Amino acid sequence: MKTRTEQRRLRHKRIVKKIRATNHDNRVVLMVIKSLNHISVQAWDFSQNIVLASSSSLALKLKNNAKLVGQDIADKLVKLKLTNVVFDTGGSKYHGRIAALAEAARERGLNF
Amino acid sequence: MLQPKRTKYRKPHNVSYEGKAKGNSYVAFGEYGLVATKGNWIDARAIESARIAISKCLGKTGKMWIRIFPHMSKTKKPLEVRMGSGKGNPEFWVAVVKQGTVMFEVANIPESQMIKALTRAGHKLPVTWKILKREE
Amino acid sequence: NLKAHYQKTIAKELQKSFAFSSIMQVPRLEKIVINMGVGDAIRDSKFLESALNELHLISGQKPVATKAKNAISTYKLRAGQLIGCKVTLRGERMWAFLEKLIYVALPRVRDFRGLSLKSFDGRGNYTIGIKEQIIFPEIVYDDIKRIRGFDVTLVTSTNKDSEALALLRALNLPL
Amino acid sequence: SKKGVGSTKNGRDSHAKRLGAKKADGQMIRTGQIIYRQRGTRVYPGVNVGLGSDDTLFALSDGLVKYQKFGPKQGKTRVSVVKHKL
Amino acid sequence: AVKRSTRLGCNDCREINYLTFKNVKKNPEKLALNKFCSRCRKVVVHKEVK
RNA sequence: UUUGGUGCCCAUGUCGCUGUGGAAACACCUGGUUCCAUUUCGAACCCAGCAGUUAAGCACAGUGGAGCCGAAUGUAGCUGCAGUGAGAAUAGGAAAGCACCAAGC
RNA sequence: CGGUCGCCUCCUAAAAGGUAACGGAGGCGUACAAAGGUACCUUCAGUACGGUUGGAAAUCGUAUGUAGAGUGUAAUGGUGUAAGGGUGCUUGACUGUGAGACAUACAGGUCGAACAGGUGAGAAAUCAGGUCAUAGUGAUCCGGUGGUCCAGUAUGGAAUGG
RNA sequence: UGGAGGUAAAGCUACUGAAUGUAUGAUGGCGCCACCUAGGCGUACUGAAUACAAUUAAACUCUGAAUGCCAUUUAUUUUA
Ligand SMILES: [Mg+2]
Numbered sequence: 001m002k003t004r005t006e007q008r009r010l011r012h013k014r015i016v017k018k019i020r021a022t023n024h025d026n027r028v029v030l031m032v033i034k035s036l037n038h039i040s041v042q043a044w045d046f047s048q049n050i051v052l053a054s055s056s057s058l059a060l061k062l063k064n065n066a067k068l069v070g071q072d073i074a075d076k077l078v079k080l081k082l083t084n085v086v087f088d089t090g091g092s093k094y095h096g097r098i099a100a101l102a103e104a105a106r107e108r109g110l111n112f
Numbered sequence: 113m114l115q116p117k118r119t120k121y122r123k124p125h126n127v128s129y130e131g132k133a134k135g136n137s138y139v140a141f142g143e144y145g146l147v148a149t150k151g152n153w154i155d156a157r158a159i160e161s162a163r164i165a166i167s168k169c170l171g172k173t174g175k176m177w178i179r180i181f182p183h184m185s186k187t188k189k190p191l192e193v194r195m196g197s198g199k200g201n202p203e204f205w206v207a208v209v210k211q212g213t214v215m216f217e218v219a220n221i222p223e224s225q226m227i228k229a230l231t232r233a234g235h236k237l238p239v240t241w242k243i244l245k246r247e248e
Numbered sequence: 249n250l251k252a253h254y255q256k257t258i259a260k261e262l263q264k265s266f267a268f269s270s271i272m273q274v275p276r277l278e279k280i281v282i283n284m285g286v287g288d289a290i291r292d293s294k295f296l297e298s299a300l301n302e303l304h305l306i307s308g309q310k311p312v313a314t315k316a317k318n319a320i321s322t323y324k325l326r327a328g329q330l331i332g333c334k335v336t337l338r339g340e341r342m343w344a345f346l347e348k349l350i351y352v353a354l355p356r357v358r359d360f361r362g363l364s365l366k367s368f369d370g371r372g373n374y375t376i377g378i379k380e381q382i383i384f385p386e387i388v389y390d391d392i393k394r395i396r397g398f399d400v401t402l403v404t405s406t407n408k409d410s411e412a413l414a415l416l417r418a419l420n421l422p423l
Numbered sequence: 424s425k426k427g428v429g430s431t432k433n434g435r436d437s438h439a440k441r442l443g444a445k446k447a448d449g450q451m452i453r454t455g456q457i458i459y460r461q462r463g464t465r466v467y468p469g470v471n472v473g474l475g476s477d478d479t480l481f482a483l484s485d486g487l488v489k490y491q492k493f494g495p496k497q498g499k500t501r502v503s504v505v506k507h508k509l
Numbered sequence: 510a511v512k513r514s515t516r517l518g519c520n521d522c523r524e525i526n527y528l529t530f531k532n533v534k535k536n537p538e539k540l541a542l543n544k545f546c547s548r549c550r551k552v553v554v555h556k557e558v559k
Numbered sequence: 560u561u562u563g564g565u566g567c568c569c570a571u572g573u574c575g576c577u578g579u580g581g582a583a584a585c586a587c588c589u590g591g592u593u594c595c596a597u598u599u600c601g602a603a604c605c606c607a608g609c610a611g612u613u614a615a616g617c618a619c620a621g622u623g624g625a626g627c628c629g630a631a632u633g634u635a636g637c638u639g640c641a642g643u644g645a646g647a648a649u650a651g652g653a654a655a656g657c658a659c660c661a662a663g664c
Numbered sequence: 665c666g667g668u669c670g671c672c673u674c675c676u677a678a679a680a681g682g683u684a685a686c687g688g689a690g691g692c693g694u695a696c697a698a699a700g701g702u703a704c705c706u707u708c709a710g711u712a713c714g715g716u717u718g719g720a721a722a723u724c725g726u727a728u729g730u731a732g733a734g735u736g737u738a739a740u741g742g743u744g745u746a747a748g749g750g751u752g753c754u755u756g757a758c759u760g761u762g763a764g765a766c767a768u769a770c771a772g773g774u775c776g777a778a779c780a781g782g783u784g785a786g787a788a789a790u791c792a793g794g795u796c797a798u799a800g801u802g803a804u805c806c807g808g809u810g811g812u813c814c815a816g817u818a819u820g821g822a823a824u825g826g
Numbered sequence: 827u828g829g830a831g832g833u834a835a836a837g838c839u840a841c842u843g844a845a846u847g848u849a850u851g852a853u854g855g856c857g858c859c860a861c862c863u864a865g866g867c868g869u870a871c872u873g874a875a876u877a878c879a880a881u882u883a884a885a886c887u888c889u890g891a892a893u894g895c896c897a898u899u900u901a902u903u904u905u906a
């Protein structure tokens with residue numbers, strides 16, 4: 001019935017609804033999007049609905065064990081001195097590639 | 113006798129007819145219709161008398177459409193009883209008729225015969241009747 | 249495997265039969281389900297275990313039993329009391345358990361002459377009913393005190409039923 | 424003489440809890456005040472407002488209070504609190 | 510009325526701390542939870558008391 | 560500027576019908592041996608690979624079919640016979656719109 | 665004589681809130697160790713075509729539909745990716761408190777940010793002080809039961825009280 | 827000046843009950859023949875479902891005012 005992508009968008013809507021209702025501090029949310037070919041990340045600063053930084057395989061990288069999209073975004077955010085975020089798995093599951101991204105993000109000066 | 117087969121709530125609020133005929137303003141099925149110039153309550157018995165008058169004088173050629181219907185019930189406390197201590201049982205059903213509702217209407221029979229049929233009808237109803245014709 | 253014959257010939261065959269020029273506009277057979285409807289478990293005749301075991305025997309899929317989603321007082325089945333059983337088998341199992349019917353089972357039926365003239369849904373599905381499970385080879389004579397049949401379906405990835413005709417004809421089914 | 428009646432069977436009712444709106448627009452409120460009392464969410468909690476398990480709309484920070492329209496046919500009502508120029 | 514309530518007491522110090530409700534007619538088992546005990550200052554197993 | 564992602568908006572955003580395109584991307588797809596998983600199953604979740612695909616999803620052009628929206632006049636109610644003004648009905652609109660980010664431009 | 669005597673929901677109740685009558689309809693004197701709390705996944709009933717036992721109606725797959733389904737229960741309100749259905753883990757169905765409000769004659773009732781202790785779920789943010797909300801209950805006195813960094817009619821205890 | 831609301835009014839293929847007609851006519855009942863069961867024939871009638879036209883409602887609502895209300899702005903007044 002569903003198209004495996006509208007369904008993922010729906011799970012993401014669920015997650016963003018919980019976040020937008022619960023986030024009492026102004027913590028910047030860290031959205032990760034998982035595609036069959038590779039992966040991308042962007043850090044939506046809510047309460048203004050603009051984007052602060054981003055990363056992807058298309059930073060001259062290969063096809064996503066590519067946790068490198070974690071070290072660079074960690075660097076970009078810590079240059080903005082926020083370092084207190086909340087993670088967002090899109091519609092994915094906190095496992096496999098997403099986990100390898102999140103752990104790399106944590107171990108370079110983030111707090112989430 | 114016209115009567116709803118079964119109603120939800122047996123004892124409702126009385127509906128004041130002091131208005132200008134929400135709905136049924138104009139004749140809609142026949143060439144001539146009977147209009148009211150003073151709103152009132154006409155029960156099922158009066159609708160029956162009017163219907164049988166129109167049918168008796170109509171002959172076996174034409175058609176009569178009744179527009180109103182005794183949707184609303186009505187109560188009547190039994191006699192020689194003090195007031196209070198409940199609400200009396202429902203007795204008779206009545207169709208609310210606002211001022212200017214085309215309630216009866218006839219078709220397919222000469223002009224003068226229809227006018228006479230309507231006059232023979234409106235003398236059973238309490239409402240001060242009037243004759244209207246279909247527009248075009 | 250029957251899948252071998254399909255991926256060897258059928259794609260080209262049905263690609264040329266209908267002017268498509270898209271290698272996978274050809275219909276693809278997607279899943280097969282098996283249901284029996286073990287309703288003789290009013291409360292507990294054998295509590296469905298015989299059905300589960302035999303359906304496990306016929307197919308490599310582990311059987312699963314469905315719970316009633318309704319309440320019926322006409323029988324002793326209301327708001328629970330799982331009845332029946334269900335297999336949804338695919339992969340190599342889908343292609344193989346299919347031919348294992350058509351090449352083993354249907355010649356062993358009481359009378360296998362013809363069907364499928366009117367059994368299509370009209371949206372690309374098909375069904376087969378069997379009146380007794382004793383006919384199939386993956387079973388011994390011993391069974392439940394009653395012998396029941398099967399309900400199997402063929403659902404493909406096309407909605408126009410004539411395409412299902414074409415696919416099942418290309419796969420040599422008894423029409 | 425007298426007459427026979429009785430058994431009304433409909434002389435009962437309940438206390439009317441005073442559910443409704445307590446802070447209209449424009450009001451300066453402090454955290455903890457209840458804005459709206461209701462049975463079921465006739466008003467949704469927006470931003471800087473919380474919902475107490477009595478489905479009670481109550482504030483969480485200082486600021487002006489605003490009602491708003493949203494929903495599939497612009498028929499649902501949100502309530503929210505805006506911080507001052509801090 | 511129906512006296513359906515019951516009382517939980519800690520086992521180490523045997524006070525009668527907690528109060529709750531349990532319907533005997535269905536689950537005859539004696540409740541054994543583990544909750545905060547003010548005397549013991551920690552989460553201790555509480556079991557039912559008459 | 561076009562493609563993809565996504566938040567805000569809640570149908571003038573839909574539902575559908577006819578065609579056009581897929582370098583980069585988005586999906587399909589190919590396998591399931593690994594982390595992980597099905598009330599059972601690599602359907603799905605999750606991995607690791609891009610031979611083939613514009614079929615389907617996605618986008619783009621046209622579509623006034625249903626659904627949706629709906630002006631003015633006039634009227635009903637109102638509140639001290641003038642201002643207030645709906646509902647229903649109608650002409651008619653309508654094939655969405657607002658931002659930020661990555662690419663080649 | 666009869667009926668009623670507290671509490672809960674709708675209408676009457678006149679588009680804030682309130683608002684009487686022997687006015688119109690109906691319910692309660694609870695239920696659940698999961699129907700609580702949390703993470704994760706999933707989202708109608710019905711109808712039509714198609715299928716052995718199998719029938720109007722069990723189940724099976726397919727589409728269609730925009731809620732007529734579900735929501736422990738009365739009615740109302742709210743809720744279709746939810747507050748509904750399934751699963752794993754637990755017991756926050758915590759202790760000590762409480763700024764600020766609601767509605768109130770008094771008594772009482774209701775909501776609750778935030779703080780300390782020590783926990784559960786979870787990668788984490790977060791959530792959790794009983795359930796989707798609204799009833800589900802009864803003062804004081806007297807006496808009993810369990811604990812005690814209280815007193816103990818001169819003193820030490822005890823009885824008796826707190 | 828902004829806002830909660832669901833009344834008056836209006837409306838009912840926008841649901842719930844009630845409910846008028848014309849067209850299509852199912853469910854059936856009167857007969858009716860075969861056949862002893864699976865069934866056919868036209869139905870003066872009850873009307874499933876739908877279309878078209880037209881209706882009613884304190885406990886009906888896709889819609890919906892004015893007055894009144896709450897708070898706030900500005901002017902003036904009162905120390906209640
Ligand atoms: Mg729950």
Ligand SMILES: [Mg+2]
Pocket residue numbers: 699795
């Ligand atoms: Mg509950």
Ligand SMILES: [Mg+2]
Pocket residue numbers: 795
């Ligand atoms: Mg409850």
Ligand SMILES: [Mg+2]
Pocket residue numbers: none
């Ligand atoms: Mg002494």
Ligand SMILES: [Mg+2]
Pocket residue numbers: none
């Ligand atoms: Mg009215």
Ligand SMILES: [Zn+2]
Pocket residue numbers: 519520521522523524546547548549553
């Ligand atoms: Zn203890």
